[PDB]
């Protein structure tokens, strides 16, 4: 039509306008004031422990924010709490859906929530009054499967669906709060911001938005991949973040200059990313791969320094403790380690 | 200090053994993916065993269960890598479809190729048997116009059909079966097998061709350990 | 971003000759295999033919084989499908689609109704 | 026809919202994250071994 | 003067060859049980083979028992203990193979690799307790007429004829259950390589199998006469002896991917 004829003109026309922006807005590349800095030199870690007990090939993983209960779910139908010092394991809940895809932890302690192939988010009370860890709530509504759940707090849970859109529930209630929709791909992972004001998402469609959480609209849309994105992370100030996709190459985008900053890629990888995170203070890049490995990613000059190769399978999760101990990774071969 | 330790080790205690009455369980049971062409036929075959429907069945004191999904949208290259561990995808296809046969071919071609389900078997039902026949005979619906290789085609020595039906009938379904076992015969890694039939909504034999499939799949699994 | 922008389209007596055109930007064209489809008036999305990286292996449907050819120039990304003697059931929409992941030789969803990596089509028109 | 207009109108008007945007230079920024990489790489045990006796790992 | 180039050669051949197979494996089920297998194997030759070979410079062929005065008492128990394992060892291999290819969907849940490692201790204590019944004087054990071995004692008693037929009842166990899995892979290449490849290597190990543990069972059930005059029970220990070498061979270093690539090279 002549209608969407100079719809989509405008929309091209803008398009071009925030491209000339960025391009204005761009005077001197991260690899170039960074090159001054000396290197992180090389980074070697060393299998620490092994959590076993697990049939299936594991999905997610979620530390405690007090850095020593750890949670992990796996496709034979079973959510563990482990502890991570000791290798106890604390609690074993089944589940009612045999596809687990995620799993998080309530910031408090006191709940986990955990949802997959069956499009709903179900939250187990672990503190329950003198009985067993049981069901306490079921949110459903999504159309698709869902790839991630994380708690704002013991009340409020931010999720994303496999029908394009991620949604804000009230766990007291029951029902949607809030609906972002603006993807045209499945949203695969979601990152809070260290002030949980917003939060980022990554979908099929190589492009990653930032939402915010209270007015429910999309801030900024960063598109510098160039194939599906898997992973995604904040930087721990919260300025900035880290997206890992399937045409084997990191990238760190700033939420200051609206545009990628750095580039974390090798011509001898050509295997996507399943799972990016940060150390403490940032430095670190740690990414897991289909080929089995995890690389450690200096995200400042941008060059690798450091391998994790432990794990007989895909690497499926990759997570680190809140305090900046420990590294725990889960595999497709049914066993979490733990580095440091 | 040590009571909140022991107490700990119990906890640990009880939740290995019932982890372990939890393993027996996991393994005596063989999960199949049942993912037909979508208005195929494969709803007959549920028939005659939310996010995702379950259908538990049960052969020779053999448990298996099928799984089928349902309110999912119609990409399926991030949900269909949790099923790399199902030991068998029954994979529908309604032949009196012909352009649904070369959507299905496609669909056979990305699954026999991907990188994850490069070791899972398929089970090929080629259902939707009447109406081909219905068609062939008629001589009103073609499947020279949408396969150029249908005259040519030569019907193979092997593999005698039942007398009761014409020999166009033999022709055509056998003709469907080699396209789908080119792509099967594609060469390269994988480590897989296609186990191809020919089924309809009257066989109440599906049930039974499944477990020999799986039986047959799980001696060339067993077969592997004894290699390097 | 990834941009797919199609040409070459327009109207043609049955019998006819033309040549869409593909141009790609945003990804390293080489990596991936090519597909054309097209969407026919009240029916779906329908898979025409497919290049791969290199351009060795092609494939088309069958009711496209001998008429219609595909080739690709990666020293200047571009994604050609020279259709031949054209009939009046060849009239549709065509899109020039990669498939999501480099390096593979599987697409999955490329006759999805919901695909980011399509273009938004031509119209080829054949009638007298 | 009229379904893609509403998504049409949908896209330019984010674009319109999300094109008014005040973005500082690469400078600034890059600098503020190697500030914070700076300021906190003393207490980033990953960053530099930690000694054996603390270490819950041991 | 008796040459020892005899023992000489095999007890090398069977020590490299031990030795070769263990190599490749000390980096499933059957992983476990070959190792075991092996072990056994090693370890008898290590603890019996030295004794046989001691007896040939301490002496020409005057001083058949040098060392000690009950020292050949030693050698029958090692030989009849070792003899025993080996077998049941390749008894619960072949039985192990027999399952998985036979009946798969029961082998699917109970049989597990954690107790695999449990063979060894039961086959140990079963070999202990039948080797044993002897050496309380329920039997006898005299030394042979070359001097340099100990066994059973033909005659005024029943236990060679019990050893020698619980022998025959394993042999002729694996030698069933290597033919039930040969029949299972035929089936299985009709219903459809690799099947006509460990057809290969199944049946080369069957020929092997039944041409090396026969001879002793039959030579066991003959007078004690005709058998040390004509030297034929040092062959029918020999041939044993020569199954428990060629067992790791076919079992670690000969595996059907090796076979198969020979066979497509050639
Ligand atoms: C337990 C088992 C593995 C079956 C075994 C049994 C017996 C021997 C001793 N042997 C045979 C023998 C018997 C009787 C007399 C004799 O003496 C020979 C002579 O001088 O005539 C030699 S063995 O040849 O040392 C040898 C062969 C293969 C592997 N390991 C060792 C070794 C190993």
Redesign the interface.
Known sequence: QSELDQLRQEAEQLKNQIRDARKACADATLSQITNNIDPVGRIQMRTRRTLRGHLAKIYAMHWGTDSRLLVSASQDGKLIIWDSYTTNKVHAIPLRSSWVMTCAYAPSGNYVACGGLDNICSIYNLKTREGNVRVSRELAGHTGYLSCCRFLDDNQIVTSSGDTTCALWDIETGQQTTTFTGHTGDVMSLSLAPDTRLFVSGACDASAKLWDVREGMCRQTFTGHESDINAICFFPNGNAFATGSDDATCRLFDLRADQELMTYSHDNIICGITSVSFSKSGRLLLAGYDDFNCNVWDALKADRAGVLAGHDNRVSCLGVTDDGMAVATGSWDSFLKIWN | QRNEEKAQREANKKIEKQLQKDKQVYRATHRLLLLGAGESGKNTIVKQMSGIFETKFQVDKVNFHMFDVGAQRDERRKWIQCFNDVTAIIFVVASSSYNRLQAALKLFDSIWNNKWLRDTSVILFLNKQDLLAEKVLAGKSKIEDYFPEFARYTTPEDATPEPGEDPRVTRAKYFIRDEFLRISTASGDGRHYCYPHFTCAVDTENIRRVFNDCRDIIQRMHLRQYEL | ??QLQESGGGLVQPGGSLRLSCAAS???FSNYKMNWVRQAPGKGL??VSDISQSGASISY???V??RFTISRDNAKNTLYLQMNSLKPEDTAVYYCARC??????????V???????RG?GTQVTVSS | NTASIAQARKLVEQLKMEANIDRIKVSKAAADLMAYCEAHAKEDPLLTPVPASENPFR | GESPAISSVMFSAGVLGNLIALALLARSLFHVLVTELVFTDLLGTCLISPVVLASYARNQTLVALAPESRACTYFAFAMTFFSLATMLMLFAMALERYLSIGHPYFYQRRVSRSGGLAVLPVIYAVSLLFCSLPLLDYGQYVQYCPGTWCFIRHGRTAYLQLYATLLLLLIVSVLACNFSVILNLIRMHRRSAEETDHLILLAIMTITFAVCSLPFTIFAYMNETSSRKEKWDLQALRFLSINSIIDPWVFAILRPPVLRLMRSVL
Do not use: H, L
Not at chain 3, 100 to 109: G, H, S
């Open positions: 971003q990834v945003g990804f390293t329908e898979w449907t069958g009711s084989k001998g999501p992941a480099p390096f593979t030789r599987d697409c999955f969803d006759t999805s109704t919901t695909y980011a990596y938004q």
